Amino acid sequence: LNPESADLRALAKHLYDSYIKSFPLTKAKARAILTGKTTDKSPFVIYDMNSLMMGEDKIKEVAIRIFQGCQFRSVEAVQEITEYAKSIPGFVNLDLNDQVTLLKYGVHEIIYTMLASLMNKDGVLISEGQGFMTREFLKSLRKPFGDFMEPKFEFAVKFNALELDDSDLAIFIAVIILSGDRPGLLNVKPIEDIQDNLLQALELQLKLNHPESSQLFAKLLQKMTDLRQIVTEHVQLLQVIKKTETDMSLHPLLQEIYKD
Ligand SMILES: CCCCC[C@H](O)/C=C/C=C\CCCCCCCC(=O)O
DSSP states (O other): OOHHHHHHHHHHHHHHHHHHHHOSSOHHHHHHHHTTOOSSSOOEEEOSHHHHHHHTTTOOOHHHHHHHHHHHHHHHHHHHHHHHHHHSTTGGGSOHHHHHHHHHHHHHHHHHHHHHHTEETTEEEEGGGTEEEEHHHHHTSTTTGGGSSHHHHHHHHHHHTTOOOHHHHHHHHHHHHSOTTOTTOSOHHHHHHHHHHHHHHHHHHHHHHOTTSTTHHHHHHHHHHHHHHHHHHHHHHHHHHHHHOTTOOOOHHHHHHHOO
């Protein structure tokens, strides 16, 4: 290690530190619950209509209720991600407008990155890990709701194969937020300078933590293309909902985000 790389390590430690402080459910905790490393942290499995009402006692119409649940957790994440953002060096010093723009386009890409930590080919964790809803149950929901989660799962399965851990992800989502190609950015240069530093930190982090993983750095940046697609698709389905479901409300915070 040299004087320059040492600064990168310092930045990684910081971000990873702020990550833990901002997200109550890390991937480490999620993988531990999902892989039987438990007896005290075993989740209740929801795989059908009956287990749904059963769990609602342990952890209108089902479909809508489930969707209303996703909303609640989304707003939660936005709040958490927004708190993590503030710890990214230089972030809060940027033009307020840009701060708003970066969160606007970055929040959902981050959510799907982290939501993968709570997934496996067969399902996803819910209620801070207390529950576990099967991929099949969600895919059987009343249309067009049964189409909501499938795309996320497909991504998660591929993304999870990279075997990244919390310390890697902490820098990675920081890179996501600080994107100079966001639409409407007033001052791009300042942002790119921060991202340039994060990328440097990520690269070193991946090299050190994943020595036998060839071109993990490059393979990880390409995943950013997968996230964009998932976001584009979500908005489309969300539009359909807005019209076929005029009696269902959407949290204003989330509304201000999709107006892109
Ligand atoms: C990165 C964001 C983490 C999201 C955590 C959230 O609990 C997981 C959602 C995964 C699929 C949504 C299915 C609907 C879940 C309905 C209940 C959610 C709950 O009570 O936690």
